[PDB]
Amino acid sequence: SSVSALKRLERSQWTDKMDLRFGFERLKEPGEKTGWLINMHPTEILDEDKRLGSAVDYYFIQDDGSRFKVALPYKPYFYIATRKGCEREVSSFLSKKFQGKIAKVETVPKEDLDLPNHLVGLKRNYIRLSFHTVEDLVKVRKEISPAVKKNREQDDQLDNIVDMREYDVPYHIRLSIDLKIHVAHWYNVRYRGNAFPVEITRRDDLVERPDPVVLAFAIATTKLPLKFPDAETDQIMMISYMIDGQGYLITNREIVSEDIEDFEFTPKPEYEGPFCVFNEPDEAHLIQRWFEHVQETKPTIMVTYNGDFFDWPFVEARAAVHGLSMQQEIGFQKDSQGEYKAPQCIHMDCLRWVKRDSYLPVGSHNLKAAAKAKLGYDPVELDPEDMCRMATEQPQTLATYSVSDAVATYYLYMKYVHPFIFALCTIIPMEPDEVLRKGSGTLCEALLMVQAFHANIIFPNKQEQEFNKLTDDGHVLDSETYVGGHVEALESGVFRSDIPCRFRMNPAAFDFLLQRVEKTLRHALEEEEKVPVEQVTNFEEVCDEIKSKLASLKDVPSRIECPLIYHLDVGAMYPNIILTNRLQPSAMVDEATCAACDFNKPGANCQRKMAWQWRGEFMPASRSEYHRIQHQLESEKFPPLFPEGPARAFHELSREEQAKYEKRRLADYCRKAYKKIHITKVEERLTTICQRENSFYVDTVRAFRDRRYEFKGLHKVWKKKLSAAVEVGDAAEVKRCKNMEVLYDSLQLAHKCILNSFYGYVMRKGARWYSMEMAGIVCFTGANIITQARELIEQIGRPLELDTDGIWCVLPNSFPENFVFKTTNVKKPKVTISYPGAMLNIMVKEGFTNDQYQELAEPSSLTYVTRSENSIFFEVDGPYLAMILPASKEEGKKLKKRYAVFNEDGSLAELKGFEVKRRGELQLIKIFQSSVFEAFLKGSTLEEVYGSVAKVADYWLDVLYSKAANMPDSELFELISENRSMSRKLEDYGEQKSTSISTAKRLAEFLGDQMVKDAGLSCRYIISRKPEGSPVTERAIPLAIFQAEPTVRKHFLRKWLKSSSLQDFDIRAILDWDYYIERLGSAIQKIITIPAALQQVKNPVPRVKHPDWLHKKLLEKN
DNA sequence: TCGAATCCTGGATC
DNA sequence: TTTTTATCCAGGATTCGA
Ligand code: SF4
């Protein structure tokens, strides 16, 4: 006991000293106060017996920047269930044995959705156990749970208990759920004295957020030449930081040759960047002064970029060299999770947001690229290798650089991150840094728990996962999965609204549309616009012009016309389908309940049936073979966990070991025993959805959708008011309006993110509310919608690109496009409607709409209303100027999500899948693709378009023929060199074989083992001519030898090229030019020639030849 | 002797 | 206590059978 008590109370007292040093005082005496809740953490406090008690600390900040704490007790608890009539016996035992280890037990009725026939109104009983402290709960939990499983397998005083629930919610989550306490609101707090718990209440009459002091910093480090730094060998060079927009810098005079002068730096006029600099003689004075000043300002938030990895451990180690205890002086320490934390201030790292919520591509997550995109300017570089000489020769250029990593970090954190995470906190019972670090599945689950609690619903336990489950015929299932969505590119080449194209349109489709024009328009006016057709005056005329143009299309169906390009898509399709079908994780059933439900009367209508496709993957062996495979294991013996241990029999293994060994044994047996190792089989299934079941989930999604659209509207209102304030030019009014705009947009983005999270959660294996069926039906209905949206277009025109949620298509110029209706309504005098939308939304409304939606009218009545609903609608983007798609070089393949698209201004509108997003495999390919995409815009006929695109191919092919004979001498290297890197150590690869490995060995044979020892080896390398016919993984040369010393260069080349007979060793002679030509000739062949061949023009590039099958088909034409 | 299929690592995917 | 991983692509080597 004593060690535990003194350990926890001592660390508590130290934390109290630490946060008292930063000015957080515990609320000392009875009183009443208000503030903004900035953080909370669990801690123990003593009771009136001086026993331990679990509690939570709340940290508050006031308007004036004063700060205080409160501590708050709450007894945790969990539920258990029992057999018929057992609760008096069970409670008698449980109270007697654990006396003084549990606080309270009671019987409570609960709503439980798995109980048969429960819609009649029944609800079941549970016993609640509650404990003085969490450790006593953990001990009783571990004594209890062994008794449960055997009882479930059977389907006496302890053994009768049957089940347990909610035993694993985190205690701070439990309290924050239960008392409705959420960060980022103002609160009134009252302390009466120890006779009463402290009382907290939210107040809604306050809005504007307070202004926390936040700090951002960066560090710069000495290193040995061609070495990474290490904390023993290398001193600090610079540490630079911002607080309250003021900058500060310190730099080590051990390497800096003279004292630095202060200066002002400014990326843009809005970025004030004043700095102050101290010069002191050594690194110990640097670190001491840094702590001495940081202890002055006492910030609340600290931010760094990937700072858990590089920035903190470095200074922690350098602090250790001088014996400075940062964990006492600052109070930062590394948690069991592996990440830095402190009891009193929050460490926010921008990268976890950039990785999760920015939608930047992998290439762009460099700090300087992220700054360039988000802030609109580039911080200019200095290489770390240069710092030592710059600090010798001209240090103030390095000082000028050292601002660029700080200021961009601070402004990125403030503008994008800071308004957002605090907004997302307001709706979820989690801490800001937990909400940043945790994944969106957990974020959703912590939300749904709140609704399940307030509806008094007992949670389900986590979905424990089975292994080696058997198909009914006996086959061992290796996976299950629903058939996903299907993406296909139907067509290839160039479309431009400036040049004609050939259309052949079915003559019945324009009659089928013309028969229903009034239907197509009435629905779009009444339902979408919400103006009754009574109130529109010109409605008869627009119908006449529609009918007459459609008839004119009927008269001449096959024609040449300039194209219209349109993008059609469905706004948040998956939420809308969930709402429309009433899909809920629990709402699925099978007849085993409907056989026993008192609502299953003749003429009941609560059953909705739907279909989905299941894709079994399973091994070929039969059940009777599997039983023999099992029984053969019942005499096998297995190794211990470590060489000293005894051998284990197969029943002494863990279940993952058992499954792994059975899978290995059966796969090995099957490879001989059967012709094919495993099988896949698509099979489609019906599933009932019970329509009457409790609505809480779908109501939650509905609420989030509507709140999102409210906040969108208020955002636009405030943005307009901000524009007015900007034109008025009152700085206080501009500030107020901008702060409103920032808050409202931040809430809009939070709501969007949470709403999108609701679909993906049910994918999370193990998750509390998990089902496969709903994730099947929600896909297969989307594939139905997007198939029928294709059929009707293929008759009118031609689709070009399907998608997960939209279509790109081309339509004839003579199509009706857009119209305006004239209306008497005060709110809406003129209204614009687009025909392509109203053409489809009727079809969707007719086919998909649901006629079985029911709702409970009055809880005591058992009366339900029957209703119909539909939220599924199409919308339209465009038209556009040009659209371009590549083609597969292999005949049978259709690509996915490659194309480009251009606005009518010629500013690029989209570009997807192409390497020009990435670093590219080679700079030559990246630049080529970039130049050709722009070049396609030029010219005015297909022959002219390809004729003037090919002049970009020739300008490069002249290079690879002329061996860079014009290009500056070393500038060849930065064009031709790959800069790839090895992923892992060769000691971590082991048996693997690759180019990067081969060149790593080639580097090792020059450098020795000095570098291959290091992880993540960087490579710069080329392909060498002289080893003619050597297999490609043997070909590489590392660049650096061409820049090393002359005799070394000569000797190692003579070693590598297998010849002494080449006189002049230059990359121009040495490269396998034809390899790079054979690569450019394979990029060009998917963009400029094969697409052109698919549109019946001749090959525009004589220097490149078609693939065999295409040439065969083309000659077969002749 | 040649064609195609499997499996591999590697980056990338929102 | 817990994290996106399956899917897709791209280049590459090795095996199998007419
Ligand atoms: S779907 Fe209707 S009839 Fe079937 S179990 Fe549910 S409530 Fe009863």
Shape: globular
The number of domains is 6
Main sheet strand line-up: 1-4-3-2-9-10
**What's the name of the CATH homologous superfamily of the largest domain?**
Ribonuclease H-like superfamily/Ribonuclease H
Summarize the model shown.
Belongs to the DNA polymerase type-B family. The protein is an alpha+beta fold and 1118 residues long. The chain has 6 domains: 2-74 and 180-202, Beta Barrel (OB fold (Dihydrolipoamide Acetyltransferase, E2P)), CATH 2.40.50; 85-164, no CATH class; 214-419, Ribonuclease H-like superfamily/Ribonuclease H (Nucleotidyltransferase, domain 5, 2-Layer Sandwich), CATH 3.30.420.10; 493-580 and 776-877, no CATH class; 882-969 and 1076-1117, no CATH class; 980-1019 and 1025-1070, no CATH class.
How would you characterize the overall build of this protein?
The protein is an alpha+beta fold and 1118 residues long. It folds into 6 domains: 2-74 and 180-202, OB fold (Dihydrolipoamide Acetyltransferase, E2P) (Beta Barrel); 85-164, no CATH class; 214-419, 2-Layer Sandwich (Nucleotidyltransferase, domain 5); 493-580 and 776-877, no CATH class; 882-969 and 1076-1117, no CATH class; 980-1019 and 1025-1070, no CATH class. It has a 6-stranded mixed beta sheet with strand order 1-4-3-2-9-10. The protein has a 6-stranded mixed beta sheet with strand order 14-13-12-11-15-18. A 4-stranded antiparallel beta sheet has the order 6-7-5-8, covered by helices on one side. Strand 3 and strand 4 form a beta hairpin. The longest helix has 33 residues, at 696-728. The protein is globular, with a radius of gyration of 35 Å. It starts with a helix and ends with a helix. Bound molecules: iron/sulfur cluster. The site of iron/sulfur cluster has 12 residues, from helix 19. The structure holds a DNA duplex (14 and 18 nucleotides).
